[PDB]
Design a protein around this nucleic acid. Sequence first.
DNA 1: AAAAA
DNA 2: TTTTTGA
DNA 3: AAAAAC
Length: 336
Amino acid sequence: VKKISQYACQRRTTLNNYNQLFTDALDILAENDELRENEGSCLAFMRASSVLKSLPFPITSMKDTEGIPCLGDKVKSIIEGIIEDGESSEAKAVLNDERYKSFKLFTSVFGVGLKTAEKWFRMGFRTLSKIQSDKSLRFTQMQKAGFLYYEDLVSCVNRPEAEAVSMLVKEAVVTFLPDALVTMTGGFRRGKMTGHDVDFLITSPEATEDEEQQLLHKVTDFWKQQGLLLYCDILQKCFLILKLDHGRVHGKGWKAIRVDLVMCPYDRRAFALLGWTGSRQFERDLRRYATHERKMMLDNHALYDRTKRVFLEAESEEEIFAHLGLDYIEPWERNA
DNA sequence: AAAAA
DNA sequence: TTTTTGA
DNA sequence: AAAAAC
Ligand SMILES: Nc1ccn([C@H]2CC[C@@H](COP(=O)(O)OP(=O)(O)OP(=O)(O)O)O2)c(=O)n1
Ligand SMILES: [Mg+2]
Ligand SMILES: [Mg+2]
Ligand code: NA
């Protein structure tokens, strides 16, 4: 009776994936298209994977794909092949491809993205040992930290670790802004058991423009004094690596944790929370829906109505969804 | 690569 | 067909 | 001074 929407923001996606055989293969094909600079094909496989993640049952025949959007002929051929023998020949070929294997291995280092991974591959590098020991290569400060804390950063962050980090963030923040509201965002807010990092949104109802600007500098200087700041890059947001002492979590005695902090003006806290909760696919479809379906412009700071020529205010995520004409999707339902 | 224009 | 695809 | 980091 009700048709599944092509937009992740109009679907409820919980962590209960009944189609991991299909979505793990589609995620690999998407990743390969990203690497081959085929943005369009990458996005089409990411949307197909996203829609299957929303299904309340596993696909067991081609009839089960009827009425599902984002599944064109190429995607249906991949699903048909997996139904046939439990494997994707297309995803198998990508997993065995030398360029794909090198890109996965190289980008697993913090500070190494698509361009540096492509550069190293075209130079003839295939292993991290050969890259690290090379006498000609020059590494960014980010990459140096990425190699130094590699084992800790490649292991993912669990909930006891995320909670321990939350305590450290809150303790540091209230020291400089006692009325500040600190919220854990990202995957952990969506109910995830693990993550590659821990993200936080910080806002204060009484802080000045200058106080708001200085908070991230004060909090990171405090941690630098404590010898807990392993890496720091302040852009308002900051990308950090913190030293998490084992005793704080309920070998070396500590673990390197990737932490991101975002500071926003109090009146924009709902837009920032919505943008930083994710998932990435849910955020893209929210913005795409706003543009193509409502003629609205949405970002982490505001919502603008082009037709009415007015900014739309929101004190909560629920008010953003209502402005967009969308049913409210809970954070644990945004795992698109 | 799929959907809309 | 061509444009769009988050920003 | 492009890249990585959302
Ligand atoms: N390309 C991206 C990446 C992130 N975000 C927003 C939504 C997710 C939030 C967190 O970024 P990440 O930490 O990379 O996302 P993650 O969802 O938390 O996954 P993980 O738990 O593995 O970190 O920032 C976004 O809009 N676009
Ligand atoms: Mg995260
Ligand atoms: Mg992040
Ligand atoms: Na990386």
